[PDB]
Short mmCIF file of C-alpha atoms in Angstrom, two decimals:
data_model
loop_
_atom_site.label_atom_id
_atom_site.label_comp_id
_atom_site.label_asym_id
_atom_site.label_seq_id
_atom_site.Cartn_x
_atom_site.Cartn_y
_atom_site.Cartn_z
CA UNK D 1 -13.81 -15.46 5.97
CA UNK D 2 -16.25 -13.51 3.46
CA UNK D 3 -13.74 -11.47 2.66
CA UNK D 4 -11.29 -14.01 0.79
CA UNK D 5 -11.22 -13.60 -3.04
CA UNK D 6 -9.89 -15.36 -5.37
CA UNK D 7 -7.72 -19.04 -5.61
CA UNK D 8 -5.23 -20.16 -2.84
CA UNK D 9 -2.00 -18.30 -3.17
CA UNK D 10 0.86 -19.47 -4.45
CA UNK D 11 4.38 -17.81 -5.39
CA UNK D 12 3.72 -17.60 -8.57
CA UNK D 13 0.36 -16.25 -8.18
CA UNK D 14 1.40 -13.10 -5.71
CA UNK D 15 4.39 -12.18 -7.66
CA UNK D 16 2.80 -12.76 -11.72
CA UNK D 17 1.90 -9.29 -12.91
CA UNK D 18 -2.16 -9.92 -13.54
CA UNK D 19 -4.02 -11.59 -10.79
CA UNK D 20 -7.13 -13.89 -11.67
CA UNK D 21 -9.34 -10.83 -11.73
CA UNK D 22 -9.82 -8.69 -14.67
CA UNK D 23 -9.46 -4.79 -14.21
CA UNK D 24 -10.85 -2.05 -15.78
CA UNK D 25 -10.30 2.18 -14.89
CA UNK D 26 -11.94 5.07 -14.53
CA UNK D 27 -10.17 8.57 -13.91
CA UNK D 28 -10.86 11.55 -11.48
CA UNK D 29 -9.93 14.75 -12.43
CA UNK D 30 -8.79 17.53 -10.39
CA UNK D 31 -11.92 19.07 -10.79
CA UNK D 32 -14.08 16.02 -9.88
CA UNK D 33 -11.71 15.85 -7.38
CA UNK D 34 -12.23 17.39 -3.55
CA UNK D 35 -9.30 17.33 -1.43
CA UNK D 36 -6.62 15.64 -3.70
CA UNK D 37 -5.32 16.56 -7.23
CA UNK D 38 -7.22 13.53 -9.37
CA UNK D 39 -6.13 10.03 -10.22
CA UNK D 40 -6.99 7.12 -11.89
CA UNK D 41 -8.90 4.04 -10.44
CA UNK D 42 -8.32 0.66 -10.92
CA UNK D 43 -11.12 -1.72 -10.28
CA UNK D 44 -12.25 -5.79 -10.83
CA UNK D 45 -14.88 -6.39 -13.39
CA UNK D 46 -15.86 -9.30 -11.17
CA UNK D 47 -18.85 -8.57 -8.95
CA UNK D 48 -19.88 -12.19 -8.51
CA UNK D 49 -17.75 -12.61 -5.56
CA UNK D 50 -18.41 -9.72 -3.65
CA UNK D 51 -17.07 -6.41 -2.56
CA UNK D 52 -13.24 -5.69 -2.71
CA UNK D 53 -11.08 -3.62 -0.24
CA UNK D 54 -9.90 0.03 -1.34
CA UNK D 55 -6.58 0.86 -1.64
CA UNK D 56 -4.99 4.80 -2.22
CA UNK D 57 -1.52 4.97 -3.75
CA UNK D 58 0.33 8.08 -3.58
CA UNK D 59 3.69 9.50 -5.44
CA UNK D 60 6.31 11.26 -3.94
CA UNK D 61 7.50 14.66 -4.34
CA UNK D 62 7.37 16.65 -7.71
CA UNK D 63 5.83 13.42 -8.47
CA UNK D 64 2.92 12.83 -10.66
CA UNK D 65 1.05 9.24 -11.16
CA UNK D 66 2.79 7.66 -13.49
CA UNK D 67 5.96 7.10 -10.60
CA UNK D 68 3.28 4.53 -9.28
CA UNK D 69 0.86 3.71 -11.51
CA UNK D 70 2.47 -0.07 -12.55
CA UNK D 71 0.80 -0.54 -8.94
CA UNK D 72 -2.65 0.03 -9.34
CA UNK D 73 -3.60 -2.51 -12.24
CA UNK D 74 -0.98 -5.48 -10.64
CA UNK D 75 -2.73 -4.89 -7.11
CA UNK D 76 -6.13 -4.59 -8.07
CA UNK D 77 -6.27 -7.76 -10.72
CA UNK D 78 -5.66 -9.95 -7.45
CA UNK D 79 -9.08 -8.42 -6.11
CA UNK D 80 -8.80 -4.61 -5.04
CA UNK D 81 -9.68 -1.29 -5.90
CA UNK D 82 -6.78 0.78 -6.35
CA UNK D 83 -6.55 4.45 -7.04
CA UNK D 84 -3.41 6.16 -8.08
CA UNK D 85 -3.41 9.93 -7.07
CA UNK D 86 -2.25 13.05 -8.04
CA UNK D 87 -1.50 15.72 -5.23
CA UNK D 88 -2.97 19.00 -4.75
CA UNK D 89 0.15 20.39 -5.55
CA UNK D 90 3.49 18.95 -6.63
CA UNK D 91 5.61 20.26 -3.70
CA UNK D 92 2.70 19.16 -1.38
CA UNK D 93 4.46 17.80 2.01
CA UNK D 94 4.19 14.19 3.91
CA UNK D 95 1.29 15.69 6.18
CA UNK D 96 -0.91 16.77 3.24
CA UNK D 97 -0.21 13.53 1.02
CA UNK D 98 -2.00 11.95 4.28
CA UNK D 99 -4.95 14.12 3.88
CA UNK D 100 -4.89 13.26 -0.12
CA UNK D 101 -4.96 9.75 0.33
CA UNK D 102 -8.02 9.83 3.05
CA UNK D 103 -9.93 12.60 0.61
CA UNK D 104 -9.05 10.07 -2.52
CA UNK D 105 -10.22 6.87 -0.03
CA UNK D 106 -12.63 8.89 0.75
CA UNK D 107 -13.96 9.80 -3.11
CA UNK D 108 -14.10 6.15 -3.59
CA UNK D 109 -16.94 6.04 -1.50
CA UNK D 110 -19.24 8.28 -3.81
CA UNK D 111 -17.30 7.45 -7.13
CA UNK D 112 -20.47 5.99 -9.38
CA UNK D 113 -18.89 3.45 -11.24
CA UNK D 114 -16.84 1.86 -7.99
CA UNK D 115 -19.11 2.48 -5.06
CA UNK D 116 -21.26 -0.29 -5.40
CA UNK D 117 -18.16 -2.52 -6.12
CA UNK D 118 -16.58 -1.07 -3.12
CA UNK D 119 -16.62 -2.68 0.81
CA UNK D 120 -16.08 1.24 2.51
CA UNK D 121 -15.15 -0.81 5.83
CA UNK D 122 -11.91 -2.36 4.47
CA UNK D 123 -9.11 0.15 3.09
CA UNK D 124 -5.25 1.10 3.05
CA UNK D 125 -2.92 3.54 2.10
CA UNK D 126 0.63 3.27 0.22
CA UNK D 127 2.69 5.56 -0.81
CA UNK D 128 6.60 6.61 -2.10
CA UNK D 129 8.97 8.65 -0.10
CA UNK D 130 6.84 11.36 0.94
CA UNK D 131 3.99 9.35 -0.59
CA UNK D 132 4.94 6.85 2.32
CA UNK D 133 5.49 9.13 4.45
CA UNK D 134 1.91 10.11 3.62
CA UNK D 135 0.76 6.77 4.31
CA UNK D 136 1.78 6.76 7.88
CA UNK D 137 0.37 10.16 8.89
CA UNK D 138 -2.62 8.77 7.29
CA UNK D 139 -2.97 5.78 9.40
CA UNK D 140 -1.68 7.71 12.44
CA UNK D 141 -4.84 9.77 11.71
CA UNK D 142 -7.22 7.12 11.12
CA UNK D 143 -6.84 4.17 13.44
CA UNK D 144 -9.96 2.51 11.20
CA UNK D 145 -7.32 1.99 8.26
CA UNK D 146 -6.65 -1.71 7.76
CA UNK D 147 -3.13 -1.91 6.39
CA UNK D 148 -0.19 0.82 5.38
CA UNK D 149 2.61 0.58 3.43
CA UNK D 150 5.17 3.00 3.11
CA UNK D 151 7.22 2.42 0.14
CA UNK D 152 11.11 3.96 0.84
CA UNK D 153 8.84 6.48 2.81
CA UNK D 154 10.26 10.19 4.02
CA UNK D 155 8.97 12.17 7.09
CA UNK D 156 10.38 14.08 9.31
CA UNK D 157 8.46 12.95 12.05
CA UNK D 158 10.01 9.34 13.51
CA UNK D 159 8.00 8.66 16.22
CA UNK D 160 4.78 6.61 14.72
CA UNK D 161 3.73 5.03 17.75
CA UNK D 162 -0.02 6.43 17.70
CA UNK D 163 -0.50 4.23 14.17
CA UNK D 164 -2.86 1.33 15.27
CA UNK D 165 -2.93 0.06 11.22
CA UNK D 166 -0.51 -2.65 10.50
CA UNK D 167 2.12 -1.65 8.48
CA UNK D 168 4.35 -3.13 5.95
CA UNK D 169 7.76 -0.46 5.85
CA UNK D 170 9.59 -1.72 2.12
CA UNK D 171 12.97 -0.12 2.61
CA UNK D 172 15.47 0.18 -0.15
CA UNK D 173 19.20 -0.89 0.90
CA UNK D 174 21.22 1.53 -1.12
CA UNK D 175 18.61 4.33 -0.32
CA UNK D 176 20.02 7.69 -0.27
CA UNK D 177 17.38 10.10 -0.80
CA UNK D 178 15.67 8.25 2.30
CA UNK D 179 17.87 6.06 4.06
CA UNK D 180 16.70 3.52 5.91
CA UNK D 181 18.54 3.96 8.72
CA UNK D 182 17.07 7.63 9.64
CA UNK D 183 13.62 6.68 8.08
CA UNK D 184 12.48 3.17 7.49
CA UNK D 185 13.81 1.64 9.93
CA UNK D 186 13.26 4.01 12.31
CA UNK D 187 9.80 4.25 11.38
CA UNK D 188 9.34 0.53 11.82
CA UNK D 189 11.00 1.09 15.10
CA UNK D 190 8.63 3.69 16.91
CA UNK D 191 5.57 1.72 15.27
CA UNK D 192 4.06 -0.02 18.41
CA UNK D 193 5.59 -2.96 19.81
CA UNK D 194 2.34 -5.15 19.92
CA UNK D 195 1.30 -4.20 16.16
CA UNK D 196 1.22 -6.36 13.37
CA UNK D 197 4.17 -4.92 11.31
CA UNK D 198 7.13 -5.96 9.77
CA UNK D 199 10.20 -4.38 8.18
CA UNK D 200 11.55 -5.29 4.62
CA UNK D 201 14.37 -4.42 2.93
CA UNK D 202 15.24 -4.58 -0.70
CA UNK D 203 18.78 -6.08 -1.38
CA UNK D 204 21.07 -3.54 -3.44
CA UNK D 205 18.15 -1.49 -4.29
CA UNK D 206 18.12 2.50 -4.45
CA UNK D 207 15.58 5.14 -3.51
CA UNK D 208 13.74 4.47 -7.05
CA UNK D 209 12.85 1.03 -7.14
CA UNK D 210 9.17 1.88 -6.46
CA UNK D 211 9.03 3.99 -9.52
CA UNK D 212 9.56 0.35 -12.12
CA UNK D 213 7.76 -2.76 -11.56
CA UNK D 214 9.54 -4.65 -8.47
CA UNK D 215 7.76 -8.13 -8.69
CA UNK D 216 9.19 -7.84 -4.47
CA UNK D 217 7.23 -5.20 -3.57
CA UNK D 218 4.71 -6.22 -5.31
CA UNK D 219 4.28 -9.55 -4.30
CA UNK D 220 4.75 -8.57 -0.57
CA UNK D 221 2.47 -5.64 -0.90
CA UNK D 222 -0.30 -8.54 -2.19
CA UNK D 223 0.25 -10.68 0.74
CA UNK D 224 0.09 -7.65 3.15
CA UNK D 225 -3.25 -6.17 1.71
CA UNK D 226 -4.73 -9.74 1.60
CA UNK D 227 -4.10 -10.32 5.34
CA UNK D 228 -4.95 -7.39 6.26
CA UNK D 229 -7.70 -6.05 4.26
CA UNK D 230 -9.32 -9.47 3.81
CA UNK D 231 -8.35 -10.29 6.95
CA UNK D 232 -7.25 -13.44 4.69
CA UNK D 233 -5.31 -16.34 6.48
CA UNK D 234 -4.36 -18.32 3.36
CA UNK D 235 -1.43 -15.19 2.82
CA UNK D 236 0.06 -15.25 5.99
CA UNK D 237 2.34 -17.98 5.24
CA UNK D 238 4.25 -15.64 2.34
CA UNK D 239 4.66 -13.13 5.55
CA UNK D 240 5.58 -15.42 8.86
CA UNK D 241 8.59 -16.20 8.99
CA UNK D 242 11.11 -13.89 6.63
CA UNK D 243 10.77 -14.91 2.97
CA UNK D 244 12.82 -17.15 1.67
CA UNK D 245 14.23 -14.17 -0.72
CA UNK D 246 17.45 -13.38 -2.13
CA UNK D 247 15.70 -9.78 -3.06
CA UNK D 248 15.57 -8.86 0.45
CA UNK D 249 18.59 -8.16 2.74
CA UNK D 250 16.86 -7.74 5.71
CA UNK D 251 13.50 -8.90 7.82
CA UNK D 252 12.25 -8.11 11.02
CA UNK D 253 7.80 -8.91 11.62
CA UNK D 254 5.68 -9.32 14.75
CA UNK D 255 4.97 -12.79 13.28
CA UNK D 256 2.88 -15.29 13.93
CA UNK D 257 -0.51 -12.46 12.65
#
């Protein structure tokens, strides 16, 4: 695997809060911006290794980036680079966040100080509450996407079964603004069959969980944008079977990857 960066995994190493990599950021304004509302972009220093996989993040509604920003540095220090978004709008809906997240993927492609650090082949959305349910219309709408994770994600749209992008759906128990029941789940239910996905729920956790560091989604986020953006075997162990995780109150995954 050329893709693989960084030590073995461990526990500790997908759940600590800095990764082996250090990160430095650049911003994109709304101006510089075309098609989303500007963002911030977290990137590793270290070129010796190679390229890195590209990862958009986007907030939810009324939402700015500082509801997700804790995100972008913790992801990227393990070997990514992450850009938090603004949207076009605040009230913009879960079909537009999509578009926002491919225009800000797409950005990174151009972006001067990140495009040569960049592997364009290898990216992923994420994204909270409508954010998520960004994400998914995003991968429903580009089939090249290599993971998506919808974080407590909203849509009104259930059926997902046109997403070809494996997809990690972090639900939050005690979720009210989004309940899992009429969204995560269901999401994770109309996702095809015979796609690598898998469901998580947080134990006891409510719709905001995303907006605070969570070293669970965090960690789980890692392992799902190292399999599946580095295509990266040593992280499938953290995903197949359920984690051994008092955190999370329910698992279902279309382990063995």
């Amino acid at each position: 695997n050329p893709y693989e960066r960084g030590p073995d995994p461990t526990e500790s190493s997908i759940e600590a809060v800095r990764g082996p990599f250090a990160v430095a950021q650049t911003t994109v304004s709304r101006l510089q911006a075309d098609g989303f509302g500007g963002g911030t972009i977290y990137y590793p220093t270290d070129t010796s290794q190679g390229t890195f996989g590209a990862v958009a993040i986007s907030p939810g509604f009324t939402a700015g980036q500082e509801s997700i920003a804790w995100l972008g540095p913790r992801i990227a220090s393990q070997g990514f680079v992450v850009i938090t978004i603004d949207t076009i709008t605040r009230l913009d809906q879960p079909d537009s966040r999509g578009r926002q997240l491919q225009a800000a993927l797409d950005h990174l492609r151009t972006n001067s100080v990140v495009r040569n650090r960049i592997d364009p082949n290898r990216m992923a959305v994420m994204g909270h509450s409508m954010g998520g349910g960004g994400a998914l219309s995003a991968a429903a709408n580009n089939t090249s996407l290599e993971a998506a994770i919808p974080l407590q994600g909203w849509h009104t749209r259930k059926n997902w079964s046109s997403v070809r992008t494996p997809t990690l759906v972090v639900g939050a128990q005690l979720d009210t603004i989004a309940p899992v029941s009429s969204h995560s789940e269901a999401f994770y239910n109309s996702l095809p069959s015979d796609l690598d996905k898998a469901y998580m729920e947080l134990r006891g956790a409510s719709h905001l969980v995303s907006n605070t560091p969570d070293t669970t989604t965090a960690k789980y986020s890692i392992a799902w944008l190292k399999r599946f953006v580095d295509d990266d075997l040593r992280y499938e162990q953290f995903l197949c079977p359920a984690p051994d995780d008092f955190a999370i109150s329910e698992y279902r995954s279309t382990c063995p990857f």
